[PDB]
Structure formats: C-alpha cells, structure tokens
Design a protein around this ligand. Structure first.
Ligand SMILES: NC(=[NH2+])c1cc2cc(-c3cccc(-c4ccccc4)c3O)[nH]c2cc1Cl
Ligand SMILES: [Ca+2]
Length: 223
C-alpha cells in the first residue's frame, strides 16, 4: 500500500497473508474454512496466516493453517487477468473471535463513488521496494466505468473495476495482490493489477466479486 496508514493490530480481522516461507499475497477469510484471493497468486505449498499484524513477529492471535486445496476460476486468463479469483480451502477450520472474523460477500455490486478499505503488506514505494512488517490500510473510492476504461482502454472486462486516485500517490501495489477491497462491510473487490503503483491516471484494477457470488457459493457447496 503506497500513501496509506498503519491499520492498527487486528482492526481488519478478515485479512490473511498467504505464505510460502515469505509473504507473497493477501486474501480474505469468508467463512472458517475458506479464503478468497486472486488466481494469479496461485502456487502449491501455501500456508494461510490469520490474525496477523506484524508478519515477521509472532505477537499472539496468529493461526497458521495449511491450505487443503486452491481452486483457481476455470476461466481465469493469465494474459488478461480476467476472472482473477481463487478460493482456498483450509486443512482445518480457523477459530473465529474478534481478532479473526470472516467478511460478508455482497448481495449487489457497489456504485462509483463508494468509499472502500483496501489493506495489505505490499510494497509501500511506487518507485522501489519497501515492504512493511505491519498491515497498511488505504481508503479509496470506486471510479466510474468511463474513467476506468479511459485509463486502461481495451483492458477492462465486466469482471473488473477501478478504485483509487487519478492524481497518484495513494494506491495498492505488489504484495497487496489477492487481498480485500471492502465497502460498507462487504467484500467487493480483490487486488488484481494496475500499471505501476500510485502513478497518475493509472488506478488499480480489482476483480469485481459481486459477479462471482453464485460461483463461490456453488463451488464451496460442492467441495
Ligand atoms: N493498484 C495497483 N497499481 C496494483 C499494482 C499491482 C502490482 C501487482 C503485482 C506486480 C508484480 C507481481 C504480482 C504478483 C504475481 C504473482 C504472485 C503475486 C504477485 C503482482 O500482483 N499487482 C498489483 C495490483 C494492483 Cl491493483
Ligand atoms: Ca506476527
């Protein structure tokens, strides 16, 4: 997160860190046994780390659980990043409390102008790499479809939306990949891609979760 602030320990209880010996992507807890992240974060040997704040210090509240299976969307296109969503089933269920809690899936899509909270342990520099130890947060609005397509002509599908600041300075970045975009307490987006981080007129593009609710529910129901 570039231009964001320190969230404060456990103030984003649904945030998870996907770990393979280091933090490589974020994700969101949607029930005690399933996490939603981005398809491009897929790899084998993933350990899901819940209740984290400082990812390099065990401070208490952490629950480290191995992923039993990862289900990348069948129509995921790695070249366009269309359908960039993945579900991860945990080997055992997590214990939910106040520090670890799941976030709700939306019933409707959000409108432009909705203010959302994006969080993660991704890069904090737009020019260079600086990865933080604790969780960063950023409040950002969903942009209109016209502004989004004007910024990324020919690359936005109906399963994507832009959120951010066209002036640059505040944005999500690499490492935040796979994590949550929550608006009015519902998970509306997944950090997917963008041109650089916090660059002028190049907002972040997020997977539009409201288009995948039936898929998520049917898939969980059958696994
Ligand atoms: N808001 C933005 N401007 C933005 C920037 C990046 C940058 C990345 C990214 C860059 C390099 C590698 C990965 C990556 C690839 C495989 C696994 C994990 C991360 C990224 O997600 N993802 C991003 C998503 C967003 Cl919205
Ligand atoms: Ca920790």
């Amino acid at each position: 997160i570039v231009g964001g602030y320190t969230c404060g320990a456990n103030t984003v209880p649904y945030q998870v860190s996907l770990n393979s010996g280091y933090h490589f992507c974020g994700g969101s807890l949607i029930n005690s046994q399933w996490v939603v992240s981005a398809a491009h974060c897929y790899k084998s040997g993933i350990q899901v780390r819940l209740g984290e704040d400082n990812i390099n210090v065990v401070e208490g509240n952490e629950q480290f659980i191995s992923a039993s299976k990862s289900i990348v969307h069948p129509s995921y296109n790695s070249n366009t990043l269309n359908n960039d969503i993945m579900l991860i089933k945990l080997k055992s269920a997590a214990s939910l409390n106040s520090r670890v809690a799941s976030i709700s899936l939306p019933t409707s899509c959000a409108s432009a102008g909705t203010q959302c909270l994006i969080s993660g342990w991704g890069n904090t520099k737009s020019s260079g790499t600086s990865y933080p130890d604790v969780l960063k947060c950023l409040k950002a609005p969903i942009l209109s479809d016209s502004s989004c397509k004007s910024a990324y002509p020919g690359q936005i599908t109906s399963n994507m939306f832009c959120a951010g600041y066209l002036e640059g300075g505040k944005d999500s970045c690499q490492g935040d990949s796979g994590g949550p975009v929550v608006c009015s307490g519902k998970l509306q987006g997944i950090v997917s891609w963008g041109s650089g981080c916090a660059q002028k007129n190049k907002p972040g593009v997020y997977t539009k979760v409201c288009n995948y609710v039936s898929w998520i529910k049917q898939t969980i129901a059958s696994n």
